[PDB]
Amino acid sequence: DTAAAIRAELAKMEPFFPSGLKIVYPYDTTPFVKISIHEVVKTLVEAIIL
Amino acid sequence: DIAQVQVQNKLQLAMPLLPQEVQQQGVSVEKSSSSFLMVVGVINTDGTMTQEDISDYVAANMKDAISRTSGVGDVQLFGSQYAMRIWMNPNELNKFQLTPVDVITAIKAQNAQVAAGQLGGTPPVKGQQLNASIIAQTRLTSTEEFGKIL
Amino acid sequence: PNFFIDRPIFAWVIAIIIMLAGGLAILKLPVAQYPTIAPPAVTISASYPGADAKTVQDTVTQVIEQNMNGIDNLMYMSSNSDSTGTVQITLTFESGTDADIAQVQVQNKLQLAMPLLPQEVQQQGVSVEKSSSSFLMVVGVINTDGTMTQEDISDYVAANMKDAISRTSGVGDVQLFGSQYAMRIWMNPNELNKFQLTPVDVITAIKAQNAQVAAGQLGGTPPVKGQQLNASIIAQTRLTSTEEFGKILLKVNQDGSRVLLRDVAKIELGGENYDIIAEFNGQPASGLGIKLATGANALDTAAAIRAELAKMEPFFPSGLKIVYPYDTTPFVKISIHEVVKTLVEAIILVFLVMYLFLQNFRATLIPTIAVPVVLLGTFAVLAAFGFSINTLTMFGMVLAIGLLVDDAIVVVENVERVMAEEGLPPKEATRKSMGQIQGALVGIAMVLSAVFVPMAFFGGSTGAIYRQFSITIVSAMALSVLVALILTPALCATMLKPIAKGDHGEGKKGFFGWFNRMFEKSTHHYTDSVGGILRSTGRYLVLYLIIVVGMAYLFVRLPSSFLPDEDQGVFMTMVQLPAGATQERTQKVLNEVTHYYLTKEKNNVESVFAVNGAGAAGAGQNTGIAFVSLKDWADRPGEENKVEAITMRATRAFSQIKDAMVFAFNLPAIVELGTATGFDFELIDQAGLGHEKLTQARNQLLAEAAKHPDMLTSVRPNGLEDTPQFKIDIDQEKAQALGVSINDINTTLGAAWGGSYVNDFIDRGRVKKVYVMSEAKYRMLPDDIGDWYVRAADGQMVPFSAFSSSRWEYGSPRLERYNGLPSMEILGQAAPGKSTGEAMELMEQLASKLPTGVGYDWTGMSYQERLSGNQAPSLYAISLIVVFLCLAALYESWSIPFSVMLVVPLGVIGALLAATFRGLTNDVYFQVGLLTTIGLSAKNAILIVEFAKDLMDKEGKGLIEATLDAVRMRLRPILMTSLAFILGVMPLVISTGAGSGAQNAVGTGVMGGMVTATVLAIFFVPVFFVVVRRRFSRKNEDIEHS
Amino acid sequence: GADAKTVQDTVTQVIEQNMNGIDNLMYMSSNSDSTGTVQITLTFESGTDA
Amino acid sequence: LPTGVGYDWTGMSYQERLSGNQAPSLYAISLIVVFLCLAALYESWSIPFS
Ligand SMILES: CCCCCCCCCCCCO[C@@H]1O[C@H](CO)[C@@H](O[C@H]2O[C@H](CO)[C@@H](O)[C@@H](O)[C@H]2O)[C@H](O)[C@H]1O
């Protein structure tokens, strides 16, 4: 949630950035929690199929 | 929240016993994680700017708002904000028989905001008919005026 | 359930228990006008004496905006930087945040920013406060003999009254309106110059001869052996008289003469600040703003306060009387009076219908006993969930009466019917019938809470308002069904008199009952007709479809509101003069208005409170406000004696026949909220741009919305436009040359024109301030600059005309910020037929038209709502799904739930009809009303279809016959209730006097809905059941006899 | 160094004046010292959140 | 004592003043709780009086 809010703020700042200003994302504990818990959900449903 | 309250309430009792340099450079009390949740990157692709230009765009356009994001404990700057940098020459200073202290005092004097007053100020005189703001000594703005500092 | 029919004492005991806890809750329960509705806001306020807008924006404001981070649950941060030297930072938080925690976090981050502040600001005190704008009452304090000036009075407040009122029980906050006494030293520049002295020396003097000093002690520790005395050293003491301040030395002259302060400057006890000058019916006054304690009872806080003032009455100085310019309390006294009045009347009407319909006295005593119990209990259930007796919760009960009343009636009736039909003894009739309506009763509770709880989960201020009604009503309802299953059956089975089989009393009596045949005949007429319509149904299906499309049309073409505006015994008129105007001019206007209300409204206006210096627009000499109090409502009978009409003739009065802008208006009801069809735009300077560029973008947008009057309407900025300001360019070179310290130039200039808080002194036992400033006559006009001289290094005086060049420029008097950044506020509302949303979309489109570095944003009201409207469809989809699921349980049908759900429009067409022909608007009271109405139609249809199904299944009767019999036996109760309801509500629909806006809002929609819904349902429901029932199954069939 | 009567109507009663609308306050008592310390105790309704 | 000299209890004596002023109320309710209860379990309306 904290992270989703921050992505909202950065997005609200995007159009007023100087010429050439891109944001990069070198490190975030977020994508692992997301894809990991999603694989566990994949598994429950798969398991119901079996 | 409460722990933070009890802690900062002891910190303010310690504050007067602190240095003025320490005091005004700012002390912070935070309920934070010891690990970064995330690291946000800022670059320029078309490389029309050095790291400082960037460091300042970050510190001057983004970092205040990100640290006001609800739920964000600490934000660390990989870089720094812009500052008025006065880099003294020991030789060219000694030549004129002046010391760093005089640089300090000078800047303190020719650069400031000043409580002025008001034309038609309150409490006025009978029938009086003009009210306006006195604009006095204002902070310096550009770099060059720091050269015209006498 | 059946259980109590054989245990009437146990029932009585639970009843008593509910009554006692409820009565206990009634005794120790809070009262307020409204609950907490607005999101939490905490403001940091600070003042920088003499400084200008840009100064306070650039010495404090930005320093604080930068130091306020990592504070929990922040929504938005908005601030004013005033050229009156005050800076205010609003931090508005997410709704439901711990108010107190937020305020604590804000004030501790500020306590960290404090060392980075100016020394003057730091020492004047920065304050952190919670921001409800809702004072319980505003007490005026005056003098009759023109004995004392307003500074005198203000001080009298601060030194004699303010403390005891804050000792009054139930008073959680006392705010002071005015300024305290100060030691005011008004320098004379001429007699200052005569003696070659500058304000600087005045400063240094006053700081020096007036001070407390760390002394010490005789017999101090560790003393010497045998030592014999311990006592206190009393040293240099602060001054006490004004006179002692006259005797302070500024210089010794060579010829032995001394130069005292008394000489260069007039010295007197006078106001800490003179911006705001207040007059009460012309006579001078000061004021006290009392806020209700947290969770406290309003009526007793007010009563206690008036009593406290009376206990102080004989101790007031000559001519000092206390007045009450603003008081929420009688609005609440009278509204409470009206709600209970309605409840008892309603009870009376249910007795009157119950007699003039069942005419058996002990029958009529049953529902009479029922509801009191239920009310009481709901008060306890509410108390348990931490509410108070306030407007919203009470009109929630007023709405609940319908459901309570119906439930009681349903039971008593059905029992009576079972007797007059079958010849059962009272009790056996009771088990037959409780056992007849039971499932319908639990189901109706499930469906009623199924529509009423989803609206509890609305978010934001809108969500709070809904939450009140939702809980009050569901609790009243759930208790009414428990009571309908435990006590009512007990009361039925026990105290009810037995009826002869096939009685109907179809005559027997001469005086009172010549009606029973008339009703009997007609109830058969009715069912005759119903079968008749069940013959050809199609035509009637058409009628329905028509009714619905029409209902939609009525729904769309009806106006949305938030709440009905209320004459509250009080209104106000605001006054705005041309930029840079004078205290004395604004004051002149305000005296004129004051008189207008005291003239052309000799009979309506009780008292007028003119405040010069503080307004709507902001602070400054340039603005005024008028607080206008109105006579008690009994003395204002007519249509012309009401606030709408008054504010009309006053705005009409001060528009055409004035030289400056004067609006007159009435406050909203929940006094901190928004203008239903309006919005609050924030135009934000996003790039490293300029104030000049931002304002130009603002003009640009004002123009582009000027081009769209079919969508947006009267779109306007909410700030102060630029004023001409006086620039003093100091030549650093010349001043350093002629031998003058720039500091001496600055601080003499300051202490001359802006003033300086120097030291503190102790009057009568209370520490106050010491201000040194020019005299009036030497600091008004720009030329006066010349009268002030700066002493040089050597010992010589220097005119400002020697090193200071001067001019005029433009500048801004009010510098606004949004989220740390430079911003500009833009208020507005939508076109007459157009929706606030459309107007907002167009506004985003226009603001998108702006130059680069210009972003846009929403704040306040527009924030809370842009979140909240996303939810009505979702919550109501939840509701349909849940209710259908419930009815799907109750029968054992996935389809029969449609024969009752199909009934919902029947009631709406009455509400929408009734609002439009009455000229009302689609607001809360109307919406809660619509739901309430849906609630009765759903109840009745659920009972009808239950009965129908029951004869079909557990009696093997046919279809058309079964529904026939059904609607037959359940005609009478329907009609009984609806008679009761329409009669109790009717007062709400036809009422003026206090609070009648809300009362009409409830009453109308409801009444219209009741009428069309029952007088439609008795015909449309049977077709619903029948037509639906005929989409199942394989023959099977249509039917009968097994 | 200040005296009792000094610290009491400069510090004690000044601070005692804002102690209204405090939830669950039972009683408030305060001391004023010429040894230089000034102290105000707030005793609260039993079961109040400390 | 002379007019304007009032009196009070605090701390131990306060709390004691409390238990004293609460004893009758306690006996009213607790007696009444039981009357209500026996009238319930024992369907008799009379068993409570005796
Ligand atoms: C609570 C107060 C109620 C106030 C209502 C005021 C009056 C208006 C509503 C009454 C509507 C009923 O009007 C009803 O029409 C149907 C058929 O369409 C009639 O039925 C009649 O026509 C159909 C065919 O055309 C046949 O079945 C025929 O045998 C005959 O009964 C009913 O005999 C009549 O009673």
Numbering used by the authors:
A (entry chain A): 301 to 350
B (entry chain A): 101 to 250
C (entry chain B): 2 to 1043
D (entry chain C): 51 to 100
E (entry chain C): 851 to 900
The authors write:
AcrAB-TolC is the major multidrug resistance efflux pump in Escherichia coli, where AcrB is the efflux transporter residing in the inner membrane of the bacterium, playing an important role in capturing and expelling a range of structurally diverse substrates. Crystallographic studies of AcrB have revealed that large substrates e.g. erythromycin bind the proximal pocket in the access/loose monomer (access binding pocket) while smaller substrates e.g., doxorubicin and minocycline bind the distal pocket in the binding/tight monomer (deep binding pocket).The proximal and distal sites are separated by a short “gate” loop (herein defined to consist of residues 615FGFAGR620) that has been suggested to regulate the progress of substrates through the export pathway.
The first, AcrB(AAA), contains three mutations (F615A-F617A-R620A) chosen to remove bulky side chains from the gate loop. The occupancy of erythromycin was estimated at 0.89 for the wild type structure, and 0.86 and 0.88 for the AcrB(AAA) and AcrB(ΔLoop) variants, respectively. Erythromycin-soaked crystals remain asymmetric, as in the apo-structures, and contain only 1 occupied binding site per trimer. The one major difference between the gate loop variant structures and the wild type is the lack of a contact between erythromycin and the central phenylalanine residue of the gate loop (Phe617). The absence of Phe617 in the gate loop variants does not lead to lower occupancy of erythromycin relative to wild type AcrB. No evidence of erythromycin bound to the distal pocket was seen for the wild type AcrB or either gate loop variant.
